[PDB]
Amino acid sequence: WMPAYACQRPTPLTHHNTGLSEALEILAEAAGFEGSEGRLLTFCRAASVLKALPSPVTTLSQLQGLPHFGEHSSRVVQELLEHGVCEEVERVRRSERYQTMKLFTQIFGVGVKTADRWYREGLRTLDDLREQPQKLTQQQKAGLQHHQDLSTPVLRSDVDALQQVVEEAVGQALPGATVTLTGGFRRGKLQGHDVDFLITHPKEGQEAGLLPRVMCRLQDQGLILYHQFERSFCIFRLPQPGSWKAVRVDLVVAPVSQFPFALLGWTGSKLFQRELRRFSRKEKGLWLNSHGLFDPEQKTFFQAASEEDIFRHLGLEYLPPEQRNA
DNA sequence: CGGCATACG
DNA sequence: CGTA
DNA sequence: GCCG
Ligand SMILES: [Mg+2]
Ligand code: NA
Ligand code: NA
């Protein structure tokens, strides 16, 4: 009965199989570090299936028939239920390769291919990277400079403060423009490692050129540590009592015709959105992105006024943001 | 066997 | 490549 | 790794 696509089932923020899903997500992460995006996707999908189950899995029998559970994912669950630990997962956890690849890829500006090159060159610590600044892009230098702050959870109080300063800059840049919180906080998370805002204006076209004006106004108030269009992946200098901390903020501008598509895309989760786009193309023959939904045979775009419109057109039961935690 | 989301900076 |  |  469990549907095969994550966009076909509700996934709440709090679920009953954290231990099993976290183990499968270790194996997914490790598959990514070794360049196997297909194995990463399967282990991610299997972990997500467990998040959608109504009760704890306590016996191997309860996996029968579940999508994305084959011999490998089932054996991991089996060893966790029988023994409380999966040897493969523990081997990965404790490996120098996994630990270093995790350390490096958590840096803003560094992905798997960069981290892997540095690993092969013998680098192992953040200090090692700092010792060779020539090997770093400007983005990576900013990621490393602010790494301690960026590893500190962002809280709702930070979000609310950031939304106010973004709203102030947006309103100074374009009267009538709006700011919508997206990302994990819109899904109900109480913490995050960044904050996402989606900006539009109710009159189509008025938002042209808006994001550079917003960034200038934020930079003039001393709020920007790093940036650099319609998407800006920033590091903000967020005031705190007596001080400040760096926070990752993403700002996105969309024309209002695209707003429901951008809201859907930027609200996530990442797996939910990959699965939704896969479902759209493979099951419905329609092409989905954060700008629109395209019928390639009629050569037309679907006009949506809400996220609900997008789900209904795809033949999917609507899921509110707090049920998209795939 | 081959696919695996789909953009922008 | 990196970001989402 | 799993599945169409
Ligand atoms: Mg973000
Ligand atoms: Na990174
Ligand atoms: Na986010």
Of A189, A182, A207, nearest to A260 by C-alpha is A182
Ligand nearest to the CA of A113: 2
DSSP state of A245: E
- How many angstroms separate the alpha carbon of residue A304 from the centre of ligand 1? 24
Is the domain of A161 the same as that of A250?
yes
Residue where a domain terminates, one of A105, A136, A152: A152
3-class SS at A226?
strand
* Cα–Cα distance measured from residue A306 to residue A321, given in angstroms and rounded to the nearest whole number: 13
C-alpha–C-alpha distance, residues A294 and A258, integer Å:
12
Instruction: State the residue for tokens 């099993």.
Output: A20
Q: Is A160 annotated as a binding residue?
A: no
Residue in A176, A260, A165, A237 with CA at minimum distance from that of residue A210: A176
Phi/psi of residue A207, nearest 5 degrees: -80, -5
**Position A83, amino acid:** H
Give yes or no: residues A124 and A185 share one domain.
no
- Distance in angstroms (rounded) separating the CA atoms of residues A232 and A223: 14
Based on the fold, state whether residues A165 and A147 are members of the same structural domain: no
Domain of residue A125, residue span: 96-152
Asked whether the beta carbons of A146 and A126 are under 8 A apart, the reply is no
- Cα–Cα distance for residue pair A297/A323, rounded to 1 Å: 32
Query: Residue A232 and residue A178: Cα distance in Å, rounded?
Result: 17
Measuring from the CA of residue A268 to each C1' atom, give the nucleotide at the shortest distance. Answer: C4
Helix, strand, coil percent content, chain A, rounded in steps of 5: 50, 15, 35
Of A56, A72, A95, which marks where a domain is finished? A95
Q: DSSP 3-state assignment of A9?
A: coil
Domain count for chain A: 4
CA A171 – C1' B4 distance (Å)? 42
Same domain for A73 and A91? Answer: yes
* ∠ Cα A36 A39 A44 (to 5°): 125
Residues A272 and A210 in one domain: no
**CA separation, residue A277 to residues A140, A182, A198 (Å):** 30, 18, 20
Q: Do A262 and A249 share a structural domain?
A: no
Among all residues of A, which ones are annotated catalytic? 194, 196, 250
Query: A265 and A222 in one domain?
Result: no
**Of A118, A134, A152, which closes a domain?**
A152
Number of residues written out for chain A: 326
- What whole-number distance in Å separates Cα of residue A69 and Cα of residue A74? 6
Q: Name the experiment that determined this structure.
A: X-ray
Tally the C-alpha atoms within 13 A of residue A315's C-alpha that lie toward its C-beta: 7
Q: What are the backbone dihedrals phi and psi of residue A283, each rounded to the nearest 5 degrees, phi first?
A: -95, -35
Distance CA A88, CA A80 (A): 11
CA-CA distance, A193 to A105, in Å (whole number)? 14
Peptide bond into A269 cis (omega under 30): yes
Resolution in A: 1.6
CA distance A239 to A158: 9
